[PDB]
Amino acid sequence: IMRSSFARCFNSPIMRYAKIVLLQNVADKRTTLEELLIERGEKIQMLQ
Amino acid sequence: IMRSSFARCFNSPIMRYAKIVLLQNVALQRDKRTTLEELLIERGEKIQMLQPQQYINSGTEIPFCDDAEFLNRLLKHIDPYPLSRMYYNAANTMFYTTMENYAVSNCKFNIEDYNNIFKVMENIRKH
Amino acid sequence: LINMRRYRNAARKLIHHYSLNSTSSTEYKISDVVMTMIFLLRSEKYHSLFKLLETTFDDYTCRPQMTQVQTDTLLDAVRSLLEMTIDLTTVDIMRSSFARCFNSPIMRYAKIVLLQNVADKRTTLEELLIERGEKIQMLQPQQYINIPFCDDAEFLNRLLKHIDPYPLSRMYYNAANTMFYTTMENYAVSNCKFNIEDYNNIFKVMENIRKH
């Protein structure tokens, strides 16, 4: 998280107003919420 | 800057041969029945993606007509036309179109709601 | 040092598309062309193919002279690269495709083209109809014919069970694109103008047929 944050801060240009961003570029498998729901889903039921 | 330019260049698509693209013939619904509310949500999301068109009226005034001769003439022409048959035809075609859309959309038809639509009759009569 | 495996995979995919041996429609970028050319150069037994495709840079420089053993070896090399039949017309398709890709300018949106400049006699559909026409009647038929349509419910149920997981839309896409590519390759090889008006009117006929 720190590496990504500092990379985005450094590559950002000098500007008068603070730029509001969201966390990104951390941790191949680009997924969405529903596939994760299914997938991790069972990995859950798998556990007793 | 040269590396960024090369990055933009290497991601440029190249020529490709044509392919046969398949388009959905009819908006076929899925097996599970849907209620009016979920259908409304989905169709509103679909409508959101459409491109609206601007309509500009010539003026703000409500359209109207006070030509007597034309009014009594239309009234005379539609005079021999029973109101019962006209209202029955209009209501029944409205109902048939609504039911056809419900059947095609795989949506459950609530008879009670459609009946409640036309209760302004008794609301007027009683009050 | 370069990664032989990634370059080989990119070359395999790009050549599969550019040889019309596959219907897989994947957006190809300039990077794939760079990788396929670099891999073709680096691999020793693809040197013939690399020189063949590199000669396409200038339209005035045409195909290098190869003796029959060289053509056979290059055919085996292409077959090995594709691990699949493949013959000379496939090489001609690849040469034309790569020539048109190379001479094309760098552009932001993929350019959609049709097969052309393969295989003197510039003809149309009707002269071919007549001509090849007789060459057909000239041949004598092999078989003379002078029908069970079983509705075994259990058997059709098992067949449907086997076919059920298949995404029908994908099957239709594959079949239609295969027919289109075979027709286009036959048109281009026969040096006959491919009238896509007629081919699209086929689909329009189907669409008009359904709604009645």
Added chain:
Amino acid sequence: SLESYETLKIKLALSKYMAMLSTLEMTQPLLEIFRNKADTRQIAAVVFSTLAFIHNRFHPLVTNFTNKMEFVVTETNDTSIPGEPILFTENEGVLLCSVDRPSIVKMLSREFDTEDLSDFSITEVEATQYLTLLLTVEHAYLHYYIFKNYGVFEYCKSLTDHSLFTNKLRSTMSTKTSNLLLSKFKFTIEDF
């Protein structure tokens, strides 16, 4: 003679709607416009002016109306609301209209049961189509008025539960809602 007076009421209202449609400068009859997907401007104008006519009938003190309207002409099933061919609402004060053209075409193209010198004449099918479009835009206006009077949430809830037509229509404005031709008839559905 009270029933004759009420029939005169209804038929005069229908004739006034007819005359408004005449003044609106139409090139084709209603159904013909609605089968013409190439000209959305005329369909939008017809729907908008029917809405304006209903608005004046419901609010007799209102003489003008907004001169702008964002509209979308629905063509495909996956963007059509069953039972609501026309829907009105507004966002950031701009009127928003949605028209389901195939649905209205099917409505007006049904086969209706049919149990001087200038050559002017009006067929029964034409008058019944006129009444049908008036009723549809009138239902849309009921939803629109529920929107204005009780919020977009009451509008959305009424889109799914039509009992707000009898709850939220208070008896104080009964004389106002009686001006609508939708109130002149009852349509019930009974299983058999």
Added chain:
Amino acid sequence: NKVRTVTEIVNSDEKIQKTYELAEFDLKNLSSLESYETLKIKLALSKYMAMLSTLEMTQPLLEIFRNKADTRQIAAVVFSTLAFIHNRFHPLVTNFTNKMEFVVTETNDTSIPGEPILFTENEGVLLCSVDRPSIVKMLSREFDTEALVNNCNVRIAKTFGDFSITEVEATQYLTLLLTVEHAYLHYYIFKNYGVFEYCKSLTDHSLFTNKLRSTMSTKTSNLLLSKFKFTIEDFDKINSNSVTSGFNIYNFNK
């Protein structure tokens, strides 16, 4: 089941009544289900595969067409496919044209670019031409069998809650079925409107809409190629070479 509707006007106690039969709405709803049409198409394909199986034609179609020596199998396969399509159009005749001959083409020199199966009259008997290398190239082409063509919620809810026919084989069966369907449309125009109209149709497929909709659109079932709307990618750009300042007064094909 029937549903009754009553309309009442405020001028009297008169009530006008209409009865609706729900079966029509149920039929429309069933015809609107994606699974229903998918089942119809897959059942047609399954019937085709069963018809081939009972004729010993269990070998993959690509292998059948790759055998140069054995022509009888190719002729039987094409004839059976034509008969199956004919029965689909006319569900009363189980046997196709009782006598017809087959000639297999192995050369480009005598090949038709785009009509692999062609029909001709030798003044004595129907003759059918089969372009074997064209069909082989069709069936042997690699298929896109991993890409997805455009419900996750039902899958999520479920997660929280013997002849070996591969996809390639089924796609090959569908490809041959569609090809023979095109050939059969040409053959139908031939048999019903003469050799002149057949050779007119070979160069202009747009006559199909007029020579089929007159009889087929109201009597037979739906055609296999009508299951999806097919279009050529960037068709307008490629067609820009042939553009007319047109005035179409007989646009019989939209």
Added chain:
Amino acid sequence: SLESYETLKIKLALSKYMAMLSTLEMTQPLLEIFRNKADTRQIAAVVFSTLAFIHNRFHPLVTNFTNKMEFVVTETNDTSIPGEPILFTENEGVLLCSVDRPSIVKML
């Protein structure tokens, strides 16, 4: 007197068509216009306004009409439809008209 009433119907309709043609600001009689291949604008105007008059007669509630019309004046046989001297249709909402001038000239 019903047959007299029907004849009055027909002849009054014909006279109204006559008066519309008069108001349309014509330089020559109909036949004369139709032999004048140099002036296609007048022929197009006559055909278009006759179409508009028929449209109003068939639809008495319609009082106006489209103000644009794409038209081609047929001169050669290989672009003429037998039995259909004038044909109307529209594409992308634009009225399309085709007039077979020699056929109408022979008719008149």
Added chain:
Amino acid sequence: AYLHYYIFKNYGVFEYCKSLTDHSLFTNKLRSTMSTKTSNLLLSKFKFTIEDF
């Protein structure tokens, strides 16, 4: 020409094209509801038949 045009508007370019070759749509597609409307046409005031001799 206007009869063909009205067939076009009311039933599609296909009904228009089919009516261009088969004129029985003038008596099929002209429903009796709009008989008063079509009676306004002077084409309806006369009959022209062709008989072989």
Added chain:
Amino acid sequence: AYLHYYIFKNYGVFEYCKSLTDHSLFTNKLRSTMSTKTSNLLLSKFKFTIEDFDKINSNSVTSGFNIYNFNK
């Protein structure tokens, strides 16, 4: 979690997994019963908004036409 569980128990697993990917169904499946019978929800004590929400959302903008805006 309890709002998700309430939709689960009262409207089925299908509606629960629909809500997991779209929280906007809460307004329709709660206000019908909870808004007039229970107390106020803890997260309703303050109006929460994301800083510069419009700028970050600019990536997903629609030329929209909202006729069922059931959630303002």
